[model samples]
Target: GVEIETISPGDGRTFPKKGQTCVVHYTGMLQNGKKFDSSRDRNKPFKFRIGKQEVIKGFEEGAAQMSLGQRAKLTCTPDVAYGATGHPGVIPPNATLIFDVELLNLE
Candidate 1:
């Protein structure tokens, strides 16, 4: 496997400016190394912006650290990713997440 440069925003990062959009490709997994979500599976890229809040909190900050064509594997705690009380039914409480991501574009 080839290594790609990845940068992570330090803890407690302030959110990006409102309305800034980013296009990205990402794969999400659990602490046990089981995959849960992926942009590649859909055959289309994942596109998101700073203000939209379409993704998790930590993931959004992670996207800010990436550059076009750069790739990263991100590990996020529930506090930054989804918090203790996740989406009520979809995500469990206190679940950590792992993500493999690539920065495709931003607008």
Candidate 2:
């Protein structure tokens, strides 16, 4: 599972379901605030489908908890992040992660 902290409010009435496409801008960091991955750096939104495993479980699960346009902070332990294997050269093994995510749209 993932831990969530809302940063700002969204419409709150609109939500997404599995198979829906989600657009977001996010920054990935470690518990220590070390930057890892980011869409904002890429200068565009990141797009993925719900429940598709295209991203990580914590990414998707956290998105699922948000309303359209909502911004949130998500916490993920190893199991929900890159897991014990970790991301080669990115995340260290068994590391916890922090994600600052904003829901841009849902399709």
Candidate 3:
């Protein structure tokens, strides 16, 4: 099942809006808690513009609902994630993914 869980409510005035770029640090894993990817491991936030389709749907959608400095965990089913085809050699087909995400800023 796909769901978004807030870990920390941010202390900021604006929610992420379309056209604004969102910067975030995220750790991605499978449902079994085996990590697949992490921006934190690179020591930098990943940046993408809202509504740009630069990332998976669940990723942008979850970030759009947050404010600066907010942290969230998203459980994503295939449809909003990698889909049934998934990412070959990376994520398995029909794999459900989980992401621990932190919204660093909106530019």
Best by TM-score: 2
When 2 and 3 are scored with TM-score, the better candidate is 2
How much lDDT does each candidate structure score?
A: 0.70, 0.90, 0.87
Candidate 2 TM-score, true structure as reference: 0.95
lDDT of 1: 0.70
TM-score of each: 0.76, 0.95, 0.93
Model 2, position 107, has a per-residue lDDT of 82
RMSD of each: 6.5, 1.0, 1.3
Clashing pairs in 3: none
> Residue pairs in steric clash, candidate 1?
21-49, 22-48
> Evaluated with lDDT, which candidate comes out highest?
2
Off by over 4 Å in 1: 1-18, 88-90
Superposed Cα deviation of residue 76, candidate 3 (Å): 0.7
Between candidates 1 and 2, the one scoring higher on lDDT is 2
Instruction: Report the lDDT of model 2 for residue 20.
Output: 94
